[PDB]
Amino acid sequence: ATDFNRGIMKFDGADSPAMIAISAVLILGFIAALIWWALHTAYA
Amino acid sequence: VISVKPILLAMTPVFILLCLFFGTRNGFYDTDQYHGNGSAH
Amino acid sequence: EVDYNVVDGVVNLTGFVTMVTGEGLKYLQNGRAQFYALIVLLAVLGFVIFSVQ
Amino acid sequence: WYDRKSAAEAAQKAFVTNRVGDFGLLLGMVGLFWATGTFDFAGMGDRLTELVNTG
Amino acid sequence: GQLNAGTILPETILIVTLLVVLLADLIQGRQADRWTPYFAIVGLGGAIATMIPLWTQPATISFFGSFISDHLSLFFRGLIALSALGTILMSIRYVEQTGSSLGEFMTILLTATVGGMFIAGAQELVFIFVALETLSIASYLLTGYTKRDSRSNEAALKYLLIGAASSAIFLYGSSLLYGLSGGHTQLPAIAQALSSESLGLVVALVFVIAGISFKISAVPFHQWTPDVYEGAPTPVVAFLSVGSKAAGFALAIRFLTLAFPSVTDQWQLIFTVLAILSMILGNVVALAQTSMKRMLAYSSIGQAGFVMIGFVVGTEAGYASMLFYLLVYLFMNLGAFTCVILFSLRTGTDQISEYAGLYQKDPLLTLGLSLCLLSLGGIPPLAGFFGKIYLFWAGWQAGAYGLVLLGLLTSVISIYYYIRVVKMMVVKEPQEMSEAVRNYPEVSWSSFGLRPLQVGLVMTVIATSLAGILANPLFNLVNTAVWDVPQL
Amino acid sequence: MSTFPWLTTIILFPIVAALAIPFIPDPTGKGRPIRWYALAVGLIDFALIVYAFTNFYDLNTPGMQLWESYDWIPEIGLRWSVGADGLSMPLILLTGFITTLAILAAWPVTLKPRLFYFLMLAMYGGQIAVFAVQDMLVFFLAWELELIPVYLLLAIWGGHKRQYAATKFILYTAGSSLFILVAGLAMAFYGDTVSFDMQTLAAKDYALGFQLLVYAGFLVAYGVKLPIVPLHTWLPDAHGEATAPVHMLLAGILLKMGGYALIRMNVDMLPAAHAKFAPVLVILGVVNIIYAALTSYAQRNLKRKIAYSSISHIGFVLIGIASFTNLGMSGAVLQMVSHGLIGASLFFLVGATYDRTHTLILEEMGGVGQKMKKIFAMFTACSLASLALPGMSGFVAELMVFIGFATSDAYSLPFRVIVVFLAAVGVILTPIYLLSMLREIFYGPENKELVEHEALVDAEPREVFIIACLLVPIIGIGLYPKLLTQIYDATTGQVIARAREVLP
Ligand SMILES: CCCCCCCCCCCCCCCC(=O)OC[C@H](CO[C@@H]1O[C@H](CS(=O)(=O)O)[C@@H](O)[C@H](O)[C@H]1O)OC(=O)CCCCCCCCCCCCCCC
Ligand SMILES: CC1=C(/C=C/C(C)=C/C=C/C(C)=C/C=C/C=C(C)/C=C/C=C(C)/C=C/C2=C(C)CCCC2(C)C)C(C)(C)CCC1
Ligand SMILES: CC1=C(/C=C/C(C)=C/C=C/C(C)=C/C=C\C=C(C)\C=C\C=C(C)\C=C\C2=C(C)CCCC2(C)C)C(C)(C)CCC1
Ligand SMILES: CCCCCCCCCCCCO[C@@H]1O[C@H](CO)[C@@H](O[C@H]2O[C@H](CO)[C@@H](O)[C@H](O)[C@H]2O)[C@H](O)[C@H]1O
């Protein structure tokens, strides 16, 4: 986590558990939304 | 449409002979400039 | 951060909760022979009870 | 002149900023082969008219 | 019936070999230890060589309803004799190095071998008991043979406790089978005299299953195995993990298919529970063992669960998968214990951490223990991959999906603690090697018994690597030993 | 020859030759006769591969060619059934080519050279065994054949977090080949035959519900091997801590099995479940592309950045599999060959610049391109090949995947719109990371804190030869794609016509 916070990717509070949790639910919820949408919108 | 087989059959002995030649053409790892053993640690 | 924490947390947690059940399942074998024969006789009783309904 | 830093950032910015348009050139190219199906300027000039005048 | 004493000629040759080894060490003493290991090897080879004319015979029930000389008992007799042959090839330098006598050791070991080989075909309840306690008492005496060690004395005491309790439970089951069938002691007569499940037949079944699963080391009866394999001499625990377990499985196939072909769903549910929880607790507690002998004990419990997968299916291919896995498990486990012997003879240690950096010192030992432990893990070109392939092929055939899935999952778990030992021997740096490998002796196969050690190691490694791809004669040899099992 | 056992020789000759590795005399200890023997065995096996291809492989036959079927164990249906299809022969040729180049690129190793070249030849015979065999149990055997070789190539050579990487790799890949064996046993015990041959298992008629379960098991087993982003985290550890030849044949070939077998036993075997799961595969390929491009951008390590780029470039393979057109499948096979070449060139160059600069962090290694000019030139060329640049083989496969997916009338119109919109933001995202790392690693003024400690020597002629041998088929296929497509356009034309019989 500290090895990712160096140089260009350097943001305060990026490896915090609250930010990791909200980014996790955002990313993986868009994954699950895209998968459910593909199973529903696309036919075959 | 041209075939891949004469191209491949004409390029593979060149590939084999140039592999056997360019094995003998190294000049960094066999010298003292390289401080290692091939492993990346 | 999501990739290194959450998905690798599921992977390392799968590898971790299979390590603490055997660092905590080895205490079932505790060095006492009379406890071992007690486990043998409890097994006899439990297998008779479960083999008849 | 890769020894300069401003030339480096300018070259990367030029490739990525042209690629922001190549995204979209590729999108319209793929979508015009999807709609028309010619990959030809005069082909999707008038087959687009045959399409859009119909339903 | 009619007495057929030509059947017992393997065990007769081995009893005569026992008597010659004992009389030679009484006549000549410790200087009889220079040739009597090779005589015991020739006697075991003669027993296996006399099993070859018996393989081309009918079923020929030998004594007055007391012995079956079919291909299943011949396979198991050859398996127990090969286990003792590898054990004698391992215990020449190890027993002499402890200051103990080798001839008395070899006679107790050959008594355990004739007990197992008499278990392998046995119809009388009393012959089952007498052969089972010949094997049991010889195993208790072999367990605490190094009696100056506190761990061997403790292992022998807590092995005799658990074994005597399991023997008396087995005997209560055998007495209940004698009473329930009227007055019969032969297993087909018991099968004919009772043919329906009842309270009392289930009791005798579970009592006998406890006495058998003591030898199998199934999971509620496994608890003697880590202490015994940590405490006893290492060739003794090699024999206990191969030949004693093969004798227990011979007893299970001989008993549950002959004496109980009526409660087959009940003991199949029992052995399903035994297999499931044996695979689980055998493959996840070996992750935390830091000694090689204790890790091999828990791995042996896991392998017993893998064999019970094929035992619990109840088809011809399931019994064949069990037989083939016991056959290849002989090779891989005798090779692993041969490497444990050869490392403890040169370093005097047993911890897995002390194996670190062995690649440049002893390359043959790392090749041997790597090939045998990866064959135990299920790595493709070796024998245990094909054994597990047959064990899961027969087990997906008769719908046992959960057992095959659990066996594959616990084999994946098994890969970790085998590859930890392979990582210690092969992966670890020269600057990260251990204190036992820094002070490693010169590799010399000429002291007293290190050349039989190297011969047994080379033979078991060539077997456990080459005989996975050459398994079709082994498949043919195994699948004719299954036609002598009732109901197939 | 045509009666000679060709693919059996191709598989078994590197293994049999690797068994003669400890008997090679080597007094100096550095392992030069061993590397020359391994290079000779690799070149001889590649010559036999191309001889069997140019003589006994017919480009207009959709069925199996170079067919051998020997009887291994008749009790369980175990047969040594090998064969060369259109899905197999470009990957067999690519395996021979990349493994010979990786053996040649493996030349700086002096740690344990006998064991190293034994494992590389035991992977050479065993990689082709995955693409070649037509038996499902031998497929599981050859699939698990790379458990211990890649473990020991990971754990002895390369990386500081190499032991955790090798441990996670071997446990993860073993737990997925679990599902390989489960699905093969399930679909071979279906009906009243126990034929384990892959053609006969494709010829069966499985009901839906069984097909969905076997597809779920195969999908777990291949979404581990092919990097699918929920199941991909073995790869950045196992590829960011590997030496350059091991990484070359580790993401040039081993990612392509599992992606070869996504066609062989998920599309060609279970089409009724492929028609149900293909929107999920399309979305997972899109998420592969975008997710792994973003994690390539955020990586400050070099090897993990290129590993994540290798995850990103197989999303187009997934989209081309789950698109039901001939051009989509053809672009998927073209991507699994082109990314093999392009990626192996990138991993070799990353290993070369790490052997020179002794660091992987982009915050170090400043103006490195002033001192290694040939590594800068080759790295820029192969990075441009990764950006789907036309005239090189990375663009043609991606364009064919885009066109073959968007013209696939099996899907709805907003689905195709949203997917080809989202699959095209990787067209932006790949120059972002792959030129920021070029700008940060080679461009700018010279990092004098680095050049004081390390000798920044330029490329050997052998390294320039390896990158030129990788870049000749890349440019030669990107300029004329029918050099490669003509190898597999028949068989894929057999596959899609077999898979379009389920769609409404
Ligand atoms: C998708 C299904 C595919 C698989 C199905 C079957 C599962 C197989 C289970 C096998 C695991 C049991 C072996 C014991 C593990 C162990 O000991 O720990 C070993 C190390 C920890 O020790 C580490 O080990 C290193 C070395 S070592 O031996 O101590 O050498 C050491 O350096 C390090 O410090 C130490 O922490 O942990 C691991 O790396 C285990 C990784 C194995 C992962 C199993 C599959 C996980 C699937 C997750 C899917 C995620 C998707 C969800 C996303 C939203
Ligand atoms: C999260 C992430 C992802 C997702 C993604 C998505 C969400 C993306 C989107 C993106 C976006 C959505 C894209 C967009 C694009 C757009 C473009 C890029 C722009 C353009 C503009 C132009 C260029 C201009 C125009 C102009 C105007 C302004 C005015 C008038 C004139 C003109 C027209 C010229 C996933 C899940 C996979 C996973 C990982 C993470
Ligand atoms: C093996 C194999 C096979 C085959 C291939 C072949 C067929 C190839 C072709 C080829 C062609 C027939 C060729 C054409 C053309 C060529 C080009 C034209 C080249 C170019 C080169 C350049 C000149 C380069 C340069 C340099 C480099 C070296 C590095 C960097 C820098 C620079 C860029 C400067 C296949 C199919 C399976 C695929 C894969 C592989
Ligand atoms: C033929 C049918 C039976 C097949 C049996 C399979 C094993 C084949 C024979 C292997 C035994 C001969 O082994 C031979 O001697 C030793 C083993 O001490 C090793 O010899 C080795 O010595 C040292 C390392 O120890 C090296 O520096 C040397 O280059 C190498 O020759 C080799 O392995 C081989 O040279």
User: Which chain D residue shows the shortest CA-CA distance from F400?
Assistant: D30
Quote the ligand 3 centre to F478 CA distance (angstroms): 9
Cα gap E246→E322, rounded to integer Å? 10
Pocket test for ligand 1, best of F152, F164, F288 (most atoms within 8 A of CB): F164
In one-letter notation, the amino acid at residue F416 is R
Give E369 Cα–ligand 1 centroid separation in angstroms.
24
Q: Is F19 in the pocket of ligand 4 (CB under 6 A)?
A: no
Tokens of D35: 């709609």
Please enumerate in sequence order all residues whose Cβ is within 8 A of that of D8, keeping only pairs 6 or more positions apart, or say none: D2, F439, F443, F444
Would you call C29 and E205 a contact, using CB atoms and an 8 Å cutoff? no
CB within 8 Å: C5 and A24? yes
Q: How far apart are CA E82 and CA C22, in angstroms?
A: 33
C-alpha of residue E414 to centroid of ligand 3, in Å? 46
Q: Residue F259 region, left (φ>0) first, then alpha (ψ -120 to 50), else beta?
A: left
**Distance from residue F309's CA to the centre of ligand 1 (Å):** 23
Q: Identify which of E92, E234, E267, E70 has the alpha carbon closest to the alpha carbon of residue E149.
A: E234
Q: Which residues of F touch D22 (CB under 8 A)?
A: 427
Report the C-alpha dihedral over residues E451, E453, E457, E463, rounded to 10 degrees: 90
Give nearest CA residue, ligand 1 atom 6. Answer: F175
SS3 F67: strand
Instruction: Please name the amino acid found at residue E249.
Output: F
Q: What is the resolution of this structure in A?
A: 3.0
CA atoms within 13 A on the CB side of C21: 12
Distance in angstroms (rounded) separating the CA atoms of residues D8 and E108? 83
Say if the Cβ atoms of C11 and F230 lie within 8 Å. no
The string of DSSP codes covering F132-155 is HB-BHHHHHHHHHTTHHHHHHHHH
Name the experimental technique.
cryo-EM
Phi and psi dihedrals of E60, rounded to 5? 40, 65
Q: Which residues pair with F84 in a beta bridge?
A: F65
Task: Decide if F99 contacts F42 (C-beta within 8 A).
Answer: yes
**Which backbone phi and psi does F134 adopt, to 5 degrees?**
-120, 10
Element (H, E) at F198: helix F198-202
The number of helices, as runs of H, and strands, as runs of E, in chain D is 2, 0
Alpha-carbon span E488 to E317, nearest angstrom? 8
What's the rounded Cα separation, in Å, for the pair B6 and F471? Answer: 19
Question: Which of F73, F144, F151 lies at the smallest CB-CB distance from E475?
Answer: F73
Helix H or strand E encompassing E128: helix E125-143
In this structure, the dihedral spanned by the alpha carbons of residues F36, F37, F39 and F45, taken in order and rounded to 10 degrees, is 160
Provide the residue count of chain C: 53
Q: How many CB atoms lie within 10 A of CB E27?
A: 8
One-letter amino acid for residue E407 of the chain: G
Interface contact flag, A4 C5, Cβ < 8 Å: no
The bound ligand whose nearest atom lies closest to the alpha carbon of F298 is 2
Q: How many CA atoms, within 13 angstroms, populate the side-chain half-sphere of residue E344? A: 23
Contacts of C12 in chain E (CB under 8 A): none
Question: What is the C-alpha separation between E118 and E77, in angstroms, rounded?
Answer: 8
Residue with token string 């970790």: E416
Q: Are E202 and C33 a contacting pair at CB < 8 A?
A: no
Which pairs from C30-38 meet CB under 8 Å and 24+ separation?
C31/E227, C33/E157, C33/E158, C33/E161, C33/E162, C33/E224, C34/E161, C35/E223, C36/E158, C36/E161, C36/E162, C36/E223, C36/E224, C37/E161, C37/E162, C37/E165
Distances (CA, A) of C48 to E266, E270, E480, F426: 10, 9, 35, 64
- Tell me, in angstroms, the distance from the centre of ligand 2 to residue F387's CA: 19
| Beta strand spans in E393-432 (E) | none
Handedness of CA E89, E93, E98, E102 (dihedral sign): positive
In the block, tokens 């801590």 appear at F241
Amino acid identity at F189: F
How far is ligand 4, taken at its centre, from the CA of residue E364, in Å? 9
CA distance E274 to E311: 11
- Asked if E380 and F142 come within 8 Å (Cβ–Cβ), the reply is yes
- Distance, CA F469 to ligand 3 centroid (Å)? 6
First to last CA, chain B: 49
Looking at CA atoms only, how far is residue B9 from chain F in angstroms? 7
In angstroms, what is the C-alpha Rg of chain E?
A: 21
Q: Which helix (H) or strand (E) holds F72?
A: strand F65-73
DSSP label at F194? -
Work out the minimum CA distance from D5 to partner chain F, whole angstroms.
4
**Is the separation of the CB atoms in E38 and E130 below 8 Å?**
no
CA dihedral C28, C34, C37, C41 (to 10 degrees): -100
Cite the beta strand spans of chain C per DSSP E.
none
User: Which partners does chain B have (≥3 C-beta pairs < 8 Å)?
Assistant: F
Nearest CA to ligand 3 atom 36: F484
For chains A and C, having 3+ Cβ pairs within 8 Å is answered yes
Q: What is the DSSP letter of F78?
A: E
CA E29/CA E43 separation, integer angstroms: 20
Domain ranges of chain B: 1-41
- Mind telling me how many Å the CA of C11 is from chain A's nearest CA? 15
Which amino acid belongs to residue F287? V
Mutation pick for ligand 4 pocket among E445, E462, E465, E470 (CB with most ligand atoms within 8 Å):
E462
Distance of CA E291 to the CA centre of its chain: 20
Structure tokens that stand for E180 in this block: 């329930």
Cβ–Cβ gap C15/F233 under 8 Å:
no
The interaxial angle of helices F244-251 and F113-132, nearest 10 deg, is 10
Helices E224-231 and E292-313: crossing angle in degrees, nearest 10, is 140
In DSSP terms, which residues pair with F133 in a beta bridge? F82
| Ligand 1 centroid from CA E187, angstroms | 49
Beta partners for E186? E124
Alpha carbon distance F375, F392 (integer Å): 19
- Residue E85: CA atoms inside 13 Å, Cβ hemisphere, count? 23
Report how far apart, in Å, the C-alpha atoms of E250 and of each of E116, E129, E215, F155, F413 are.
9, 14, 10, 42, 66
Beta bridge partners of F361: F301
Residue type, A9: M
Count residue pairs from D and F with Cβ separation < 8 A.
66
Pair of tokens at residue F81 = 């059934």
Measure the CA–CA gap between F393 and F480, rounded to whole angstroms: 9
Greatest distance between any 2 Cα atoms in chain D:
59
- What does R_g of chain D's alpha carbons equal in angstroms? 18
Chains near E with 3+ CB pairs less than 8 A apart are C, F
| E158, E199, E224 ranked by CB distance to C52: nearest | E199
Going by C-beta distance under 8 Å and a sequence separation of 6 or more, which residues neighbour residue A7?
A: F300, F362, F363
With the most atoms of ligand 4 within 8 angstroms of its CB, the residue from F19, F23, F32, F34 to mutate is F23
DSSP state of F501: T
User: Please, what is the end-to-end C-alpha distance for chain A in angstroms?
Assistant: 41
CB count, 10 Å around CB of F37?
Answer: 20
Q: What's the maximum distance between 2 C-alpha atoms anywhere in chain B?
A: 51
One-letter amino acid at E259 equals: A
Cβ atoms of E366 and E358 within 8 Å: the answer is yes
**Interface probe with E: pick from C17, C51, C52, C53, most Cβ of E within 10 Å:** C51
**Closest to E325 measured CA to CA, from E420, E248, E390:** E390
Q: List the chains bordering chain C where 3 or more Cβ pairs fall under 8 Å.
A: A, E, F
Task: List the one residue out of F257, F263, F265 whose CA is nearest residue F129.
Answer: F257
Chain C neighbors of A3, CB-CB under 8 A: none
E202 interaction partners in chain C (CB closer than 8 Å):
48, 51-52
- With touching defined as 3 or more inter-chain CB pairs under 8 Å, the answer for chains F and D is yes
Which subunits have 3 or more CB–CB pairs within 8 Å of chain A?
Answer: C, F
Neighbours of E3 (CB within 10 A): 12
Rounded CA separation F235/F227 (Å): 7
Is F444 within 8 Å of chain D by CB?
A: yes
In the stretch 332-391 of chain F, residues with CB closer than 8 A to chain D read 367, 369-370, 376
Tell me the C-alpha distance between F21 and F19, whole Å: 6
Domain residue limits at E176: 1-488
Residues of F in contact with A3 (CB under 8 A): 300-301
F47 ligand 3 Cβ < 6 A: no
Q: Which residues of C touch A24 (CB under 8 A)?
A: 2, 5-6
Cα separation, E282 vs E276, in Å, equals 10
Helix (H) or strand (E) holding F65: strand F65-73
CA distances from F146 to F43, F173, F265 (A): 21, 9, 20
**Residues in the ligand 2 pocket, defined by CB under 6 Å:** A 27, 30-31; D 20, 23; F 287, 290-291, 294, 422, 425
* CA pair distance B40, E61, nearest whole angstrom: 67
Residue E440, C-beta contacts closer than 8 angstroms, at least 6 positions apart? E346, E347, E358, E361, E362
Nearest-CA distance C7 → chain F (Å):
7
Distance CA E197, CA E211 (A): 20
Other beta carbons less than 10 A from residue D55's beta carbon: 4
Residue E310 CA, chain-centre distance (Å), reads 16
CB-based contact B3 F480, cutoff 8 Å = no
Q: How far apart are CA F432 and CA D20, in angstroms?
A: 11
On whether the CB atoms of residues E101 and E30 are closer than 8 A, the answer is yes
Q: Where are the beta strands (DSSP E) in E48-123?
A: none
Instruction: Determine the 3-state secondary structure of E488 from DSSP.
Output: coil
- Percent of residues in chain C assigned helix, strand, coil, to nearest 5: 70, 0, 30
The Å distance, Cα F39 to ligand 2 centre, comes to 49
Q: Specify whether the backbone of E218 is left (phi greater than 0), alpha (psi in -120 to 50) or beta.
A: beta
Side-chain half-sphere of A31: how many Cα atoms within 13 Å? 18
Q: Which residues contact F383 (CB under 8 A, 6 or more apart)?
A: F346, F434, F435, F438
